[PDB]
Symmetry: D2
Subunit: 339 residues, 4 copies
């Protein structure tokens, strides 16, 4: 009846580790026992409450929780006790709005979000909607699979909406937490991959993961270089959306090409409409994804095509993890290990 969990009580404050009541599932709900729980920058923004729509205090963060179905409410048929599931950002949606009926539930105006508008996975247990959980692959461990619920589906869907075709070129801009996962999806999707970053080790990693071309933006203008070397990319996935990354993306793409934006930066970005219109460039926003996107993302992991860089930490130490993220001292993804 009691469990440990990291709670946000004041925006900007450190999280407190508490013993709170174990959530019980009602009709059409399930309870999940958390075995691992991914951490990412979205959790920082949730804890700082610096986005337009804020979480309601207090709340348990975490939209990358994975574990076992430990209890089942009435009317549940998709999963059963013992099943390995994840509880992603899309906690639930209404299921009958236009978006939901067309398989774009990720756009549902009535959606709830895990570890944001409802309690998430920074706890030993969590109550989820079984219609929206991710069904985890048998072959992949909890720690390794957790980031796929977030980083994985985000970059996979992002790549899909670049509208690129096997054999065509895609630039992965930024080979960090998201980017290094993106390279692997891109290669698995038959794309020729160009990696762009400012860190030579990250570029090497990209090459190892499948990138045929890699350019260090500190040593050379990536736009001019790529235009010359590959004739511009058919697609660009921008995983870290800084003003510079945005501008460079526009310069790197070939005529008729598409730029997909994964990040959520603040402010207005300078956009060369003249060039975009003239060059017939498309700019498209894409974050997370639908249930089908998620299952597809998980399958690539199961098949051995994608493996996130993961490092573990304990629930108790979640505040140290946050600190490391804030300072940009994390390489890969960090995952809380509950076992």
């Amino acid at each position: 009846a009691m469990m440990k969990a990291a709670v946000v009580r004041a925006f900007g404050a450190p999280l407190t580790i508490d013993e709170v009541p174990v959530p019980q599932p009602g009709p059409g709900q399930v309870q999940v026992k958390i075995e691992a729980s991914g951490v990412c920058h979205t959790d920082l923004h949730a804890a700082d409450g610096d986005w337009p729509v804020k979480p309601t205090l207090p709340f348990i963060p975490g939209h990358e929780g994975v574990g076992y179905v430990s209890a089942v409410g009435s009317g549940v048929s998709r999963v059963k006790e013992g099943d390995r599931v994840g509880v992603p950002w899309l906690y639930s949606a209404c299921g009958y709005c236009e978006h939901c009926l067309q398989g774009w539930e990720t756009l549902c105006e009535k959606q709830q979000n895990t570890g944001y508008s409802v309690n998430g996975g920074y706890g030993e247990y969590v109550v989820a909607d079984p219609n929206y959980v991710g069904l985890l692959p048998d072959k992949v461990g909890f720690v390794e699979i957790a980031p796929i619920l977030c980083a994985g589906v985000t970059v996979y869907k992002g790549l899909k909406v670049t509208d690129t075709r096997p054999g065509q070129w895609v630039v992965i801009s930024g080979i960090g937490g998201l980017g290094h996962v993106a390279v692997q999806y891109a290669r698995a999707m038959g794309l020729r991959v160009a990696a762009v970053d400012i860190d030579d080790a990250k570029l090497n990693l990209a090459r190892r993961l499948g990138a045929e071309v890699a350019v260090n933006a500190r040593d050379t203008d990536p736009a001019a270089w790529l235009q010359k070397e590959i004739g511009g990319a058919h697609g660009v996935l921008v995983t870290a959306v800084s003003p510079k990354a945005f501008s460079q993306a526009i310069g790197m793409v070939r005529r008729g090409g598409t730029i997909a934006l994964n990040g959520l930066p603040p402010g207005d970005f300078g956009t060369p409409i003249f060039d975009v219109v003239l060059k017939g460039i498309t700019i498209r926003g894409s974050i997370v994804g639908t249930r089908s996107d998620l299952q597809e993302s998980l399958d690539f992991a199961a098949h051995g095509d994608v493996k996130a860089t993961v490092s573990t930490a304990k629930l108790d130490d979640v505040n140290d993890v946050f600190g490391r993220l804030r300072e940009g001292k994390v390489e890969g993804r960090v995952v809380l290990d509950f076992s």
Copy 2:
């Protein structure tokens, strides 16, 4: 031997009506006797030398010339003497680059542009490439059809790239020279049309042409109203591309929707990345169109679905017309009448 033509001999200077030699079709070329010749803002930009890539001086403007094939060079099979044809913006393209092979010849780096890089239809005769001329509908007059070569194909392709389909909502932003034509194409394409402008008469016109709803942005916030009334529009066609229209388009579009920018504004626009990403919005530019787009655009006119607002002027009075366009005192489209 000789013919009258309006000629640009210096950028920014008034045009002069000169007697010049009648152009002669060589092999693979045809000669066209101009019966009418549309005028639009692009001609100003051409005559002003406003754009980064300029016409060579001196030149005869006019990318909206229509008339009869008057002479046929050797090796021509597509048209014959007497055929009614138009010589649109796309004078020619290479035909074998990646873009040309994919049916996107509008992106051809090697393209020539009528009344810009080569002489156009502000003259009694013009030489054209028969592989790129528009084949005009039997049933529509020269004056009436001229603007379809430019305004028509521009808004039609624009609507196509909003990726909408019958029954869905599209906003036509701006019911002016392009906008009044766009409303008609949109309705013929089975779209529900919401018109937005600041002029009562233009909004009335929009409704007359098939718009289901009309919002006057002077009196009501069209973003707020449309979000509340129709849940936002699946597509937005921005026909007057200003910073304000851009920002309002983002407000009017529903999640997952597409904004098409139908013009070449100067200077960067501020793009709120956060909203674009969260809402999963697509932004793209669309100006003119391919030969396929052009033929399709003309067929809609032939079928009676689209009729541009047109008033005539004489070649001799071209500078007055330029003046009126510059002042923004033109309602509809102006077409030079050579009859």
Copy 3:
């Protein structure tokens, strides 16, 4: 506690109008009072039990029932008492299989079918799944809207999967119970309609409904004719699926075109793989549609774009209705009027 209902108790046997218990909604279910109930050939097949997968006896047919929500079980948020709803062929689907997740719930292997695998609309009351009912437009009467639940969505979805665009040609093959509805959707979707049939009166009905071209296959080869007169059709909707209509569709469609089969005939059809391959033709089947398809199809009715030719009858005369259908003596659609 009781109600009238037409019940099938023996396959092939005349239906019996019986007094049966009024069905009560459990958790997540709703009850609908039927005001009108469309009849079609699918009901004959249900009653005859001649399809591979058969209904369980005894059962109440009817998948075109429309009426008011008369009661609501617990955990129901989509509808409430008084709401006008329809209970279409797709009674329920699992909601989480590959097909359901992608908004293709019509392919769900676990689907239930109204008036086939569960009791349907040939009764005064029926219990339905609120997540799958059709939400009816306020401005259309129960009798007029009923056939939209079946004929409407069927031909609308069929038209969608012909992959045709506004301005393109579509052949409506057979201008009968389905076809006369199809001509109307097609025109509302911006398609040029060519009607093909062997009944002059049916062909003239097509023209009245917006067909531009009409060919009697009895005296003229529609394939040869259309290939000459319009260049072949971009799409063909076959609403009366016979081997001849099928073979002719293959001749009528232009290269790269698409044939949609809108029916469930018995037996294998001879298909000239040679012509299909050489002509790059696409062939696919389509019946009824998804919840999204249904709501979209109802919208066209709400806007006055589509009206089915409807005649009414009494529940007690259902066997007579069946009789007329079996003989082919039905013009338009027949709807049981529960008033």
Copy 4:
């Protein structure tokens, strides 16, 4: 002045290896010195004149000729002397019909076909239209690349039109001359490949080339097995269209899936309309492809993803070759070597 060439002079007869005049390029044409020349079953059908539209006698067959541009006609700009090119099935097209304008020149009704309606590559030299030749990759030898002009583009385009996405399952039906190349393209396109045939040596070749699953059609039932093993294939590419292969494809395909037919068999094939409609299956014909398809297909060979199994033979032995083909006793692809 003169050259060796294999000529068809009578339908069904042995080819005569003669000395004939060397074709000379006129305006807009180029001359190609053949270095290698693929042979395939289409060549047999050309020589036997058993297709509805027949070649005109006499003629030199061969639509898989590759070599060097040996001479250039007037006004040619796409290629130059020395360039390595191939002369595929699509010799030329309108350039301006609806199909050509939309980048589907493969469907042009006015197309010429290499080694069928015009002289082909079974000779030391050939004249071709530079606008339609394949531009060969630098690092691939003539013998190796030749079959890509026919087998390669055919299966690549076929795979594209199965509408399958990376991570999805495709069955390659028949691992023969076409099939063994198809397995390689499919793998490069991120598809998971199930190879199906009746020859265990072929299936081992498949696995060798990346097939993840292989099932012998004479051993077990492929439909039942794949439905169990994989849940059915999202796509099926039928490279050898035998009545049993066609029937088995309809059984192997997943609900909502697509079957692409690459073959040109004689006669009608039985198609279960009932199942096709109910399972929402798409049947699509596809052979060869556009210039864009061809260049993409060559790019995969350049990138190292695709290599045809090739064996050489001398021009003077072409009759022996045909003999080997007819007896279904040819492994991989035979290429005539003019070195």
